[PDB]
Amino acid sequence: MERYESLFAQLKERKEGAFVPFVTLGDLGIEQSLKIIDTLIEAGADALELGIPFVTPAQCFEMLAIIREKHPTIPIGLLMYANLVFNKGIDEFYARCEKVGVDSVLVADVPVEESAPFRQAALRHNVAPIFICPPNADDDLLRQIASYGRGFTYLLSRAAALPLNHLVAKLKEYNAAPPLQGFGISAPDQVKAAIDAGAAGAISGSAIVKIIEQHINEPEKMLAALKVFVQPMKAATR
Amino acid sequence: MERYESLFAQLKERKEGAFVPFVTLGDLGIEQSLKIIDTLIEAGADALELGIPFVTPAQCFEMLAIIREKHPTIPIGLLMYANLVFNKGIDEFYARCEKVGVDSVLVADVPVEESAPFRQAALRHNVAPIFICPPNADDDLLRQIASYGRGFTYLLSRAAALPLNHLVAKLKEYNAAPPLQGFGISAPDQVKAAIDAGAAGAISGSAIVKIIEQHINEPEKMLAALKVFVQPMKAATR
Amino acid sequence: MERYESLFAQLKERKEGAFVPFVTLGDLGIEQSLKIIDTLIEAGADALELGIPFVTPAQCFEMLAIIREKHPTIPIGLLMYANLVFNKGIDEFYARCEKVGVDSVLVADVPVEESAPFRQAALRHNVAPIFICPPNADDDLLRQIASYGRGFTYLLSRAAALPLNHLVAKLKEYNAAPPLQGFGISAPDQVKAAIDAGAAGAISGSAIVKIIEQHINEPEKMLAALKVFVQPMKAATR
Amino acid sequence: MERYESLFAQLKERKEGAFVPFVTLGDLGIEQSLKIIDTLIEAGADALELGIPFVTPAQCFEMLAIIREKHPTIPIGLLMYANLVFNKGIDEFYARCEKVGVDSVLVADVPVEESAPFRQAALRHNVAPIFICPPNADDDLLRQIASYGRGFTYLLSRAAALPLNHLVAKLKEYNAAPPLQGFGISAPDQVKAAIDAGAAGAISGSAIVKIIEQHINEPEKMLAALKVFVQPMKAATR
């Protein structure tokens, strides 16, 4: 299945960009985590990028399974570190992702030059291998990233760096998967600027979501609190 | 009302910088806390920055009301964490601040990028939203901070970092609210250096004030003890 | 503790207004007075407003202590005159109120402009200072009343006067404590009209309660007599 | 002698405004009245405005004589109604004021247009004739009031009205006696606002002073009670 392919096609028909929140797992229990994720989706998230920081990883996969069960169409991407993959085998890790329904995997600490085993395991298990594209990527790197990646291309957060328009223009020229500008933390105007420069959307972490995740246990209060921050981010993609 | 606006205008006419002590609430009871604050004002404080650490918060607001009642002209700024605001609603929190007479609010753990709801609630309730400016703030951040803030701009404590003169020079170039160099703990010479570099003044916490707050209950003894430390700090702003 | 805060929160969750009878003390002895108050509560009163007319005041405070002991959750507000407070000291009076469990104090003959010492003593002793809001209150007065009051705002009885909706709308705009329309004497339809106009409830005196207080000594007969008048008043708040 | 002239010169040298309480005579006996007035002076009153409501008037003049004897420098102004003056003659009334040492006289119910006989009797007896200046006084009235008055100009309580700054600015432009904003009842912040707008000070009546006048007979208790209210009013003039 190709959840990213379908999401991006649906977004274009609407001249919309994608807003993808990044949330790290491991802090609170399954129930609270599931509430936060459920609320972000109801609040307007087009896709999800979930991190398993450098709650056990096994429980995080049970959470991914529960999310997939409740939201069959939303693209779910995982961001993790190599040590986790090595723990029980590369092929085994990607088999587990395929099993639970993970759409993409970004191994954060693996340089593109040493990515072959990870990307091949991904392809063999119908999981999109995600690559990070730096601001100052030369023509070669861009051709490689466009060639190896699937799902979407992760643009590293800004802060010689090529202007967003150029980098995106080139990636599109080399048939790379849709570029999503990464942020870590961002404002609506920054998301709008990324999309105006041609990005397919944005992936951003957030201090507020983490604060709400803790401190707020009521579903209704959580939804009200998140809408205040998520709605303007999604409105910046239209 | 604009207490900061009037304080800074009066300080300029005197070629003086502002000395703003930062004191955390929550340790001792209302009476002792009120004594310490009363003494700092009699000792020479131009404004006050009060923190509600991460005595209940409700009692802290009663204290703020009592302080405002006794000192109608002195600017009172609050420094707190998002969890407190979320406890009963963002708008509700700023409404309560306006009600008691708080002049500014600095939500310490909220990045500028996710500040929209807090700053808009501040604006709607006549409370100045305060922003923290890091040493190595790029041109963008400076334009944003200058645009969103009111009352004063909080310069994060030093310890690539731009030299104080530059950072201040730029902020003034972008119409930002008066910059106050933050410290946590400082000496008279450090305050003087901040003002000589163009800062409108300094905000500093202190180990001595906390030691006096505890251990000394006599108003006369407290005043004598504080003057020894406060007078030289204020003398450094002239 | 915040009995008013909790009462109003519970009433909203039920889309109900508050019915608060006002009863003057001083006529009959402790036992009969306690019976009347006990019956009004059993009959449906959400809170109580007790007056110490312009039985000694000391006995009235013993009664307040006995009422608080028997009804730990019901808000108890006192309405009295300045001469009483001055008799043994402002701070001393509010200390005594806090001691017995009084939730609010309304000093009827003190204008808002000369209220500073009374409201500050209230704040220092965890007692809500109540202010009277006239029908034709200008924007200033409304801002001041909203700023100084706590617990609830007392709307002076009607009989240029601003229409109830407006006055309430503004008070809510300035974060004032929940407005209760005062009456002295009222009918169910009048209470309903006050709540439909946005008031949080009504405070009303009554000729019937006083007649029952005298003439009826039997607890069963008293309860039956009061229910006839109280139930419809409370039904008007739903 | 010119007690107002000297008071205002002394206040300017100190950058201070004047606080003038207004107290009506006629309620209690000479001794109690004298105690209240003595306490207001010890509490901080810069001048006194005494009213003889619309104790006989003859006794009130004996009181004025006793006050003058005990406080030789404090300006004493009288506020009364025409009927009193007519009772035994205009010239005779002002002769009596001069005799006892009254510094100024404000005949409340006499319009400026019919003031000639009163103001001329005042001038002939070295008594300052006081005039009331309304909020919406045209340029003519202002020129007349500035021309006929002495001692100070009484600004009628607010509640098209010209903003305080303007009215004061004009009066100063026409050489009028120092303007004092009248109130009837006021808070410290209102006094401060009047002075910040340029007024030479404020004259205010008070519900609290009347309550203390009755109910409190002990000099020590009276002084303590009044200081609580007078000190903040006088602090608002500095």
Curated annotation (Swiss-Prot), chains A, B, C, D:
Catalytic residues in the record: E49
Of the GO CC terms on this record, one is:
cytoplasm
Q: GO terms for biological process?
A: aromatic amino acid family biosynthetic process; L-tryptophan biosynthetic process
Enzyme nomenclature, EC number: 4.2.1.20
PANTHER family xrefs: TRYPTOPHAN SYNTHASE ALPHA CHAIN, CHLOROPLASTIC (PTHR43406:SF1), TRYPTOPHAN SYNTHASE, ALPHA CHAIN (PTHR43406)
The entry assigns this protein to a family as follows: Belongs to the TrpA family.
Protein name as annotated: Tryptophan synthase alpha chain
State the organism named in the record. Escherichia coli (strain K12)
Lineage, opening ranks: Bacteria, Pseudomonadati, Pseudomonadota, Gammaproteobacteria, Enterobacterales
